[PDB]
Symmetry: none
Subunit: 46 residues, 35 copies
């Protein structure tokens, strides 16, 4: 019932919180990766 389902929203909320966060930190890695590639290209070139 209802009340029990307010608790649903609560745990789901924590859930989404976690997600965008984690997904964010992954991106931190990717940027470092990306950019390290661009330098690698600058040497290749000149």
């Amino acid at each position: 019932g209802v009340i029990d389902t307010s608790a649903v929203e609560s745990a789901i909320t924590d859930g989404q919180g976690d997600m965008k966060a984690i997904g964010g930190y992954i991106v931190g890695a990717l940027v470092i990766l990306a950019v390290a590639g661009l330098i690698y290209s600058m040497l290749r070139k000149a």
Copy 2:
């Protein structure tokens, strides 16, 4: 008879009380379950 049947309503009432409650706490488990799945998916992905 009648009076005896008011007591019926009484015990049945307790009955339903118990039910929606228990059924509720089960759902608490399910949400935790569900959401723990979503995080598991965020790692899989990124």
Copy 3:
């Protein structure tokens, strides 16, 4: 005899009254049950 049998109808009437009532309150429980199952399914799923 007859008169005595009008009293029959009377006690039987109370009888049926009681029945549909009690049977009704049982159903209240079942609906709560049913629907609590449907929520349990929504978590399972998503």
Copy 4:
């Protein structure tokens, strides 16, 4: 009987209410997930 079955509609109604709601909040998670994937792809790429 009838009256008892109006109460059925009532509890079932709450039921469906709960469902589309919960199912909705799950989707909130999925969108965040999805889109976090698209960014992950933008880095991969460039």
Copy 5:
């Protein structure tokens, strides 16, 4: 006897009335469920 059995048809009729109705409202829940699944799939995918 006969007359008493016309009343049978009557209560049984109410009975069936109730049934297809309730069974109907359950389906309302299921559709909402179903379709909420399809959206969940659209995110998964794209």
Copy 6:
């Protein structure tokens, strides 16, 4: 005796009449039930 027993056949006849009839209307309920289950399955599935 005999004549008295023709009346037996008569009341028994009414009896059987009633039975197959009532038993019939019960089945009307069951079919509605059954089939409402099949729809419930179509949603579950797709």
Copy 7:
């Protein structure tokens, strides 16, 4: 009995009617889904 069972065929018929219909509309969703995937692939690619 027999007659009562013609009514069976009747309610079952409605039943099947409903089914292929609903199952059909679900497919409408799936096609839209499918094809939206193919476009998503055309971008990925070129």
Copy 8:
């Protein structure tokens, strides 16, 4: 006695008739169901 029991066979016969028939029409529903699932799978896939 005997004769009375030939009538038994008769009503039982009708009985079985009804059964395989009804059971048959149910299957009509199931096939429609089944196959509608297979199409649903063809979209999922391609």
Copy 9:
């Protein structure tokens, strides 16, 4: 029973008909896709 199962073959047949057809039209899309890739490669190259 048997007869009822000839109808099974019938609905299943329609089923398979549908499948190879749909699966076919999907392929029409894929070829267009594929080949559009090959042109994209001819430009890349020269």
Copy 10:
């Protein structure tokens, strides 16, 4: 008794007949499905 149980074997036999048959036609669908997937893969690839 015995004789009555030879008829059991008979109806059960028809039963199994039906089964392996139907189950067979389902497989016809699956093969068409499968293989249509393999072509879909040949385009994806080249």
Copy 11:
């Protein structure tokens, strides 16, 4: 007495005759039932 009791055996014999027969025809129904269930399962499955 004795002779009168040979007639007992006679009517009892008819009795048992009737029984195993009727009980037999009931089983005919059950087999049809059973097996119709197995087909219902083959669709469910595949």
Copy 12:
């Protein structure tokens, strides 16, 4: 009495005979079912 009860053993024996037999033929159906499922899985897969 005793002798009458040897006949009991006799009819019960036939009884058990019938049972393991019938139960056996049912299993024949199940195996066909089972295995038809495994093939269905081989297509699904490859």
Copy 13:
């Protein structure tokens, strides 16, 4: 039943509506992605 199944069509309709829409907005992202790749290629080149 029927009426209850008109409501099915209704919720399914909303369903499909949602889908093609969402699937659409995803594509908006992909195009931006794609094209940003093409510019990245123009620099690489010249």
Copy 14:
């Protein structure tokens, strides 16, 4: 079923339409790219 599957062809058709179109406009970009390379080569050279 059949009719429902004509709608499949319809949505798939739109699908393919979209594809060859989009894939086409991508090529417009590539040609401009290509040719801009050839001019870049004419300067390099002379």
Copy 15:
């Protein structure tokens, strides 16, 4: 029972027979696929 279960082994045996066979023919397709890819690579390259 036992004998009935020797027949189990028999139908299961056919079952496995079918499986490794079908699974085999699928592989025939895959090899053709694979190798057609390798040629596609030889052109790409030289």
Copy 16:
């Protein structure tokens, strides 16, 4: 009673015998299945 219950153990024993056996032959199928999947993967890959 006791003796009658030694026969219970006996039939139950046969029972379990049958079970682990049949369950075993099913596994034979599964292994063939599994491994045929792994080869399918080796082609996919290289």
Copy 17:
């Protein structure tokens, strides 16, 4: 009854405790997995 149902809450509580915990340790594995993938990508690249 009530008291007996307080014990329900108790065992269910332990239940949920266990769940989020276990689900947590699984995630520990996934992160290690994920990140080990990212390093694998850094080598691939440079």
Copy 18:
């Protein structure tokens, strides 16, 4: 008579006492069961 019927209430009271108690301890088992299922699901999943 009356007094004798006060003793009725007494033994019936003990009766009900016993019942709700026993019924309670059964539930203790069920909860342990239930929850052990939920853990089993957490492993299945992750």
Copy 19:
């Protein structure tokens, strides 16, 4: 009566003991299963 019902609690207690234990050992299997899956994923990946 009462005393007899203390013995009820006793046998029920053993009962629950058994349950949580067995249910526990099942979980031992599941964990081994789960984790063996995670390794299988590490190979798939790298």
Copy 20:
């Protein structure tokens, strides 16, 4: 009377003896069943 009722306890005792025993051997079957399922799952999986 009393003495006669000591013999009651005696036959009832044998009774319970038999029960827990038989019920035990049934469980032997179930475990074999259960566990054979878990292996079936290990193949499915890997």
Copy 21:
């Protein structure tokens, strides 16, 4: 079963037929591509 599985081989055969064919026509494109590159090189050079 067997016969049903000869049809498997049949549809799979068509399948492979299609594959090597299509894969072939793709190669026709690649050769034209390749060689058009070699001419492009002859101009570059001289």
Copy 22:
């Protein structure tokens, strides 16, 4: 449902925002790269 899907558009919007932005900053790098190449060529030359 609908409302829940307005939130979809919202998160997707942010998504696309992010993308064209990031993709933009990457291009900033590429231009700097490109042009640094052109200077490198001016020295090579004169």
Copy 23:
């Protein structure tokens, strides 16, 4: 009961034994697979 449940532990133990073993041999395959991929990459590259 208890003793019967020691046998449970026994069969479950064998069960788990089997599992980690089988799951192990599967991994043997995967490693061979994996590593054969790495060599395939060394050729691709140089």
Copy 24:
């Protein structure tokens, strides 16, 4: 299937048509380029 695969050949054909054509027009550019180089050399020289 087959017919669907004749359409494959058709779209692939158009594909190759396009390719050799485009690749051709590129060469037109290259020749003009080449030869313009040769004149540039005649001036350099004399």
Copy 25:
């Protein structure tokens, strides 16, 4: 779908716009380069 694909054309258009522009400004550099070479040659010479 369609509308969503008009937006595709739109973003692709911007895309191509950007390209021919950028590619153009690069050429501005090349001409300056080229011609600065020709002067360098006039000094070398005379």
Copy 26:
């Protein structure tokens, strides 16, 4: 059970055998490919 699981090892063994073999022959192709590239480079060069 155990014995049945020795057969598991057996079929898995064949499995791995097949794999390293096939994977091996693929490499034969790759080497031929690789080296044919190196010759192609020797011409390019001198």
Copy 27:
């Protein structure tokens, strides 16, 4: 329950241990790969 779930942590721990280890040895391969590429580049160049 709890204790049973400490064993969960234990097997999961071993699990993660295995993972980071294996994932590690894979990386050993990749580094050797990577670096062997860099040497290949030094020859290409000078």
Copy 28:
């Protein structure tokens, strides 16, 4: 596709136009250069 490839010819045409033109103006420079050399020689000489 075709139409899209007529546009290819169009942009390529502009391309070649540009080329022979630019290449032409370069030659204008070269002639002026050349001839200025010849005068330089006439002075050297006489």
Copy 29:
């Protein structure tokens, strides 16, 4: 399985055959190219 995998070797063999052949004919082109360059150099020179 094994036999099925002999066919693997067979198709792979054809595969490699094709490769070294095609790769060979490409080289024929390259030599003609190369050497045509050397003549071009003899004119340049003398």
Copy 30:
């Protein structure tokens, strides 16, 4: 849950640490490469 997700950040952190480091050491190689090229050019020249 939350706490479990702090550990996520932790392992991801190590992850990124590793990455920028490794990516760094690769660059050390590239610089040595680059510069060794410049010396190679100084000899070529003078």
Copy 31:
């Protein structure tokens, strides 16, 4: 496959044909160039 690869030889053949031809006509230009230089030298000289 094979046949498809005879067509490879065919298109490659045309390819080489084209090459030696074009390369030839280039040489025609070079000779005219060369020799025009020799006359230029005869004037310089005498």
Copy 32:
């Protein structure tokens, strides 16, 4: 999400910083190279 994408800009910024810098120091080398060539020419000449 957003915040996470501000960090993107940050790491990309560092990235570009690095690039123009490194690219700059390369040019320092080139100038030294260039000019050392011009002196080499002054000796050649006079």
Copy 33:
């Protein structure tokens, strides 16, 4: 599990062995290539 994972290290080890070896022999080719270029330059020059 553990032991099974020692075998992982073993097959991975062989793996890396193979790699550095093969990668090595490739380099043998490259050196021969390189140096053959240097001789080609000595002729060009003197």
Copy 34:
């Protein structure tokens, strides 16, 4: 694996063989070229 990798060495060996050979014959051309230049110089001179 190992054995498969001895074949690698074999094909690579042939590879290198081919290379130094071809590279050798190219040099034969260059010497003839070179020396023909020296004679051309002897005439120029005297």
Copy 35:
């Protein structure tokens, strides 16, 4: 992880070692080349 990444540094180190070395020996060749050119010039001259 970390430790595994210390080994990365190790193999990369060897890598760079190799590079500057090889690149060095190439330069030895170039100097010999260069200087042999200068002598060639001294003869040309005087």
